[PDB]
Amino acid sequence: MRRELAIEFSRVTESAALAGYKWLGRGDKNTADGAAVNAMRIMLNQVNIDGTIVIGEGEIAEAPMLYIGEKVGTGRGDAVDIAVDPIEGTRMTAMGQANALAVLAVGDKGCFLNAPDMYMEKLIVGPGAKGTIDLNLPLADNLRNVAAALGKPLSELTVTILAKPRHDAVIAEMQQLGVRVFAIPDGDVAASILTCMPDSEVDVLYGIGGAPEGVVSAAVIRALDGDMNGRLLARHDVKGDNENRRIGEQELARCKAMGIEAGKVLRLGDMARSDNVIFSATGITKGDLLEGISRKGNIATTETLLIRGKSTIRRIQSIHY
Ligand SMILES: O=P(O)(O)OC[C@H]1O[C@](O)(COP(=O)(O)O)[C@@H](O)[C@@H]1O
Ligand SMILES: [Ca+2]
Ligand SMILES: [Ca+2]
Ligand SMILES: [Cl-]
Ligand SMILES: [Mg+2]
Ligand SMILES: [Mg+2]
Numbered sequence: 001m002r003r004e005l006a007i008e009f010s011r012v013t014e015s016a017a018l019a020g021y022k023w024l025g026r027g028d029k030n031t032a033d034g035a036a037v038n039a040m041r042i043m044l045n046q047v048n049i050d051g052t053i054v055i056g057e058g059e060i061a062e063a064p065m066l067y068i069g070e071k072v073g074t075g076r077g078d079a080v081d082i083a084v085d086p087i088e089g090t091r092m093t094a095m096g097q098a099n100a101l102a103v104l105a106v107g108d109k110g111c112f113l114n115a116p117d118m119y120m121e122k123l124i125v126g127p128g129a130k131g132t133i134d135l136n137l138p139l140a141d142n143l144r145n146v147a148a149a150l151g152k153p154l155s156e157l158t159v160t161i162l163a164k165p166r167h168d169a170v171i172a173e174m175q176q177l178g179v180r181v182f183a184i185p186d187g188d189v190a191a192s193i194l195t196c197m198p199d200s201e202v203d204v205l206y207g208i209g210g211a212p213e214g215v216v217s218a219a220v221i222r223a224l225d226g227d228m229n230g231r232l233l234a235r236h237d238v239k240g241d242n243e244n245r246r247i248g249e250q251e252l253a254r255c256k257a258m259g260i261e262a263g264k265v266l267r268l269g270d271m272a273r274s275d276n277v278i279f280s281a282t283g284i285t286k287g288d289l290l291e292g293i294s295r296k297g298n299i300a301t302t303e304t305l306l307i308r309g310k311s312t313i314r315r316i317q318s319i320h321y
Contacts, residue, residue: 001048001077002106003308006278008047009104010304010316013282016040016086016102017302018320020284021293025096032093036086036102037065041072044082049073054112055083055105055212079109083216087284088189099187099287105219106278113215113271114258118251119238120211122188124221124228125149125204126195135229135265139170139206140177146204154178160191161207166238170207190281190289192217193305196224200288208238218271220279223309230266275309291317 019039023032037057044051053070057063060070066084082104087093089100105112123133123142129149133142147157155178161167163183174181182202184191188209194202205217214230221228232255236248255262282304283290291303299319306314 017282029094048076100284120214
């Protein structure tokens with residue numbers, strides 16, 4: 001402990017994944033998510049930590065379970081901060097599609113950036129390009145710098161990015177630069193980790209995705225010794241000026257209340273403040289990062305990726321009876 005808890009945390013994501021898996025292909029993203037949230041909370045509440053949910057399902061008002069500030073754990077052990085994404089890929093789960101997974105990160109008290117559930121522009125790279133990125137520079141400059149750091153031509157650089165209307169221009173810009181663009185339907189947490197996975201052609205993740213998702217990515221990227229910058233963006237500034245403005249202003253007032261500057265570049269250490277992070281993710285369906293659950297009779301299998309910032313990276317293939 002806390003290294004002794006690594007296995008306990010993997011059981012939490014295995015439970016969440018198996019619970020979400022029950023709703024795979026059932027066309028109900030809310031119910032799938034609720035099942036995974038419930039299973040994750042049940043399991044966390046049997047772990048010997050004094051956990052606070054810092055990234056989660058919503059404020060107490062909108063989220064009955066795993067709400068921001070919720071206390072979880074038996075209360076024995078260390079005060080830790082907890083980031084949960086019980087299903088990354090809820091729509092993908094509802095639709096029986098690839099790349100759904102259950103995600104948890106655990107760190108020292110105060111180790112995760114406290115920021116609103118708003119959008120964040122992200123630029124994420126692996127260890128081979130650590131120190132070569134700066135979101136204050138033009139995208140094309142960053143991409144050139146990263147390719148040079150990795151010792152490959154620009155035309156071979158592979159950038160992953162969410163396939164969303166907000167990204168039309170930048171995707172076209174990158175393709176014109178001659179880079180390879182892997183535009184993904186959802187799931188920038190899992191995709192961010194591919195930057196640190198040698199057998200994935202992905203070199204960089206770039207683009208606007210969920211802020212809490214970006215803070216989880218910062219935690220795991222830090223643990224893997226990659227690099228990331230983020231920049232918080234208000235809703236109307238990413239979707240267009242229309243109730244976006246209303247949502248946007250709540251977000252900016254929240255940034256101030258939490259003492260965060262929106263639109264300012266966040267360095268890796270601004271989002272994940274220490275190396276003492278345990279990250280666990282378990283596949284629901286097969287994706288680029290993890291195998292999916294299988295079931296034959298009364299036996300089910302899961303694969304879990306378990307990463308500890310202090311230290312080896314583990315892939316745990318379990319058979320459950
Ligand atoms: O769908 P949006 O509004 O582009 O939000 C992007 C965020 O949603 C995700 O793609 C997850 O999708 P789901 O919410 O369906 O689970 C994240 O990986 C990402 O950060
Ligand atoms: Ca959720
Ligand atoms: Ca999410
Ligand atoms: Cl969009
Ligand atoms: Mg969405
Ligand atoms: Mg890779």
